[PDB]
Design a protein around this ligand. Structure first.
Ligand SMILES: [Hg+2]
Ligand SMILES: [Hg+2]
Length: 173
């Protein structure tokens, strides 16, 4: 059986092309994200109170691309934006300069291919998530190993140090 480490996740850099308030939701954003594929992916983000819409535009992000696509009040989200989060504040993790859509986040320390699709019932993300935190310098890591785009740099939060990393739970215990 494949190991239960960050190698099971499919993380890629993306660029938010379009962002708008969700038509039928008051706390969600609807973005079209270029992840380097033929067409953009639709992403529904609950960041209304944390990131103004104007700052969501043309925003480079790190996306978890192998989660089961799910309906969000009618809109099927095809990926989720990775953020440093706490009951305090929420910050979108920023890729290093030069990163372009489609760039992959990898870890030599953890060999393995991501799962085509993460089966929620197997809660693979639920077991990995606790090892996902930003370090003392705000750099995103997995068990202390930095989220890196080979040849470009590491991903980091703006001000959130020693923080947990989530892409949904953002508002509840
Ligand atoms: Hg961009
Ligand atoms: Hg820092």
């Amino acid at each position: 059986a494949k190991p239960i480490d960050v190698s099971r996740l499919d993380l890629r850099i993306g660029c938010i092309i379009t962002a708008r308030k969700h038509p039928d939701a008051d706390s969600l954003y609807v973005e079209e994200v270029d992840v380097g594929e033929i067409a953009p992916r639709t992403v529904v983000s609950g960041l209304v109170n944390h990131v103004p819409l104007e700052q969501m535009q043309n925003r480079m992000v790190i996306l978890l691309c192998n989660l089961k696509p799910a309906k969000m009040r009618g809109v099927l989200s095809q990926a989720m934006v990775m953020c440093a989060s706490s009951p305090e504040k929420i910050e979108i993790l920023a890729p290093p300069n030069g990163s372009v859509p489609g760039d992959r986040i990898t870890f030599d320390a953890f060999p393995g291919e991501p799962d085509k699709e993460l089966n929620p019932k197997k809660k693979i993300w639920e077991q990995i998530q606790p090892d996902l935190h930003t370090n003392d310098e705000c750099v995103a890591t997995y068990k202390g190993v930095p989220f890196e785009v080979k040849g470009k740099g590491v991903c980091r939060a703006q001000t959130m140090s020693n923080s947990g990393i989530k892409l949904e739970h953002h508002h509840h215990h």
